[PDB]
């Protein structure tokens, strides 16, 4: 059996920008 | 989600790798993928439909999951990147 | 370890039809 | 989700492959699978329960994720198909 | 989700296999696993927390996804089990 | 690369019972 | 989700393994990972963004899914850990 | 084909604590 494991994370990062309609 | 590549490097998350975003500010949880952002810019950008759920100013947690063999899974030491309010690396923890 | 990666996508497509009760 | 097979061909997404749909119009995010639609018709049809979340006229992003070995993952160049308002291919980007 | 084992047999879905439930009646979408139910009973039972989202009388779609090698994926012919209002098999389609 | 594919489904089944607090 | 390691041991769920949490109290469903908690403490702690959905006092179900070969999948006997109101083990069922 | 299967679970556990802003 293969296991799905958490291998890395970036904790409490702040979102700096967003672009709903990018391309 | 565009991520300052310095952060991807420190986390060991590859560009295009699938990642989950868990929003500390509003509780949203979604799955998307990472894109390399300008190094040292501290950018964390939400592109596309995800912008409906994750907003600028939100505090988030980006998590990557892999598929492991029995042996590697038992020896796994996850990498945790801690950052400041400008997304600069403060510390990196191993397992 | 195997990684789950985004390998392809169709961007900003327009939904042309829907059928909730199809078979 | 029935997709004009010309688009599946250009994207490299196989019929029956699992795909996520991220709705740009309303923010909905779901997982389902692709079905081959009539070539050149530009069809993007939402069948079944997903019709509750994704409506005709919505702008969406269809994303497919695969499971890669370490080597192939590092050399991966994702395929991006850009289309017009009638779902005709405008351009295909590689990685 | 407890499923009349005759249906699991016809679908080729194993007991304990993960399955997604897409609710046609109310639009709910969730991931859980299948449990073998009494054969011929036509039972489709929702146990646990999922009961908050999927109610008796709801019309649902149970979908199972597998992980395929390149070759097997291209030759895959999905199995579709069609049933009546009492969950008795009407027809089984291949690919 | 391995692909995640839809391999089987039971279509338009009717939920016959539910038990939120089972064991 | 921090889990009394005695429970992880009994369940056969490894620290850092991905797990789904299905909330019996409010119906929330999410994906996260397990962290080893103090043995015998009966701790079930929700850290991070998940705290928006799963609250202290909630009754929950923690489920782990693996990826199996055809042979192992057919012989699989899932482990079920039953606990009391203080998260002490009452019984462990096999398949 | 590889199958994703439920391999283990802890049933009806009680959440004892939460920390949205931990580190
Ligand atoms: O457009 C994309 O590639 C992804 C969008 C999203 O995750 O919302
Ligand atoms: O009926 C199906 O096959 C899928 C439905 C859905 O994704 O909602
Ligand atoms: O109790 C379980 O095993 C599953 C519950 C659910 O899917 O809600
Ligand atoms: O901070 C984490 O690691 C996980 C958070 C969550 O699952 O909400």
What residue segments make up the domains of chain D, in order of their start?
1-95
**G61 and chain F in contact, CB less than 8 A:** no
Residue among B68, G19, B9, C11 nearest D22 (CA): C11
D30 Cα distance to chain centroid: 12
What is the edge-to-edge ordering of all strands in the sheet holding E35-37?
E35-37, E2-4, E44-47, F17-19
- Give the CA distances from residue B28 to residues A15, D25, G29, G68, in Å, rounded to whole numbers and listed in that order: 13, 18, 12, 31
Residue of chain D nearest C23, judged by CA positions: D48
Give backbone dihedrals phi and psi of D10, rounded to 5 degrees, phi first. Answer: -65, -35
Q: What is the resolution of this structure in A?
A: 1.6
Question: Vertex B74, ends B69 and B79: CA angle to 5°?
Answer: 95
Using CB atoms, which residue from A2, A7, A23 is nearest to C11? A23
Pick the atom of ligand 4 nearest to G33's CA. Answer: 7
Give backbone dihedrals phi and psi of D28, rounded to 5 degrees, phi first. Answer: -65, 145
End-to-end CA distance of chain C: 40
Take residue B33 and report the two structure tokens written for it. Answer: 């993928």
Residue among D4, D1, D42 nearest D19 (CA): D1
Give backbone dihedrals phi and psi of E77, rounded to 5 degrees, phi first. Answer: -125, 95
Contacts of H23 in chain B (CB under 8 A): 82
D38 burial type by CB count under 10 A (0-12 exposed, 13-18 middle, 19+ buried): exposed
**Closest Cα in chain E, distance from residue H19 (Å):** 23
Contact (Cβ atoms closer than 8 angstroms) between residue D62 and residue C13 = yes
Rounded CA-CA distance B63/H2 in Å is: 24
Take residue D82 and report the two structure tokens written for it. Answer: 């850009």
Please report where in the chains the tokens 């990826």 appear, as a residue: G67
Compute the CA torsion angle G77, G28, E44, H6 (nearest 10 deg): -20
**B72 and chain C in contact, CB less than 8 A:** yes
Side-chain-facing half-sphere of E74: CA atoms under 13 Å: 5
Three-state secondary structure readout of chain H: CEEEEEEEEEEEEECCEEECCCC
Contact (Cβ atoms closer than 8 angstroms) between residue B50 and residue B57 = no
Contact (Cβ atoms closer than 8 angstroms) between residue E4 and residue E84 = no
Rounded CA-CA distance A3/G64 in Å is: 9
> Across chain A, which distance is largest between two alpha carbons, in Å?
41
E77 burial type by CB count under 10 A (0-12 exposed, 13-18 middle, 19+ buried): exposed
Rounded CA-CA distance D69/E33 in Å is: 27
Which helix (H) or strand (E) segment holds residue D94: the answer is: strand D89-94
Question: Vertex E41, ends E38 and E47: CA angle to 5°?
Answer: 65
Rounded CA-CA distance D92/G83 in Å is: 54
G49 in a known ligand binding site: yes
- Three-state DSSP class for G23? strand
Around Cβ B69, how many Cβ atoms within 10 Å?
12
**Closest Cα in chain C, distance from residue D39 (Å):** 14
Q: What is the DSSP letter of G89?
A: E
CB contact set of E8 (below 8 Å; sequence gap of 6+): E14, E15, E34, E36
Residue among D43, H7, C19 nearest E61 (CA): C19
Rounded CA-CA distance E15/E36 in Å is: 6
Residue among B68, D8, D25 nearest G15 (CA): B68
Residue nearest to atom 1 of ligand 2 (CA): D48
Beta bridge partners of H2: E67
Give backbone dihedrals phi and psi of G75, rounded to 5 degrees, phi first. Answer: -105, 0
Give backbone dihedrals phi and psi of G84, rounded to 5 degrees, phi first. Answer: -95, -170
Identify which of G13, G19, G22 to mutate to test ligand 3's pocket (most ligand atoms within 8 A of the CB): G22
Rounded CA-CA distance E92/E75 in Å is: 18
CATH tag, D1-95 = 2.40.40.20
Rounded CA-CA distance B59/A14 in Å is: 5
B12 in a known ligand binding site: no
B48 in a known ligand binding site: yes
Beta bridge partners of G43: none
Around Cβ G49, how many Cβ atoms within 10 Å?
27
DSSP assignment string, B36-90: EEPTTS--EEEEGGGGGT--TT-EEEEEEEEEE-HHHHHH---EEEEE-TT--EE
Which helix (H) or strand (E) segment holds residue A6: the answer is: strand A2-14
Is the Cα torsion angle D45, D49, D50, D54 positive or negative in sign? positive
Rounded CA-CA distance G75/G80 in Å is: 16
Give backbone dihedrals phi and psi of D85, rounded to 5 degrees, phi first. Answer: -65, -10
Give backbone dihedrals phi and psi of F14, rounded to 5 degrees, phi first. Answer: -105, 130
Alpha helix positions (H), D32-95: 70-75
Contact (Cβ atoms closer than 8 angstroms) between residue D5 and residue D31 = no
Using CB atoms, which residue from C5, C16, C18 is nearest to D68? C5
Rounded CA-CA distance G37/B40 in Å is: 36
A21 burial type by CB count under 10 A (0-12 exposed, 13-18 middle, 19+ buried): exposed
Q: What is the DSSP letter of D36?
A: E
Q: How far is the CA of G22 from the centre of ligand 3 (A)?
A: 6
Beta bridge partners of D46: C18
């Amino acid at each position: 059996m293969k296991r799905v494991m958490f291998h890395a994370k970036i904790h409490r990062a702040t979102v700096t920008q967003a672009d709903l309609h990018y391309v | 989600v565009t991520v300052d590549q310095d952060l991807l490097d420190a986390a060991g998350i590859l560009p295009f790798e699938q990642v989950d975003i868990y929003d500390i500010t509003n509780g949203a949880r979604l799955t998307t993928y990472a894109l390399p952002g300008e190094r040292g810019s501290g950018v964390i950008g939400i592109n596309g439909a995800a912008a409906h759920l994750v907003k600028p100013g939100d505090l988030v947690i980006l998590v990557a999951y892999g598929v492991f063999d029995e042996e590697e899974a038992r020896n796994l030491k996850p990498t945790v990147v801690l950052v400041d309010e400008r997304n600069r690396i403060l510390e990196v923890r191993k397992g």
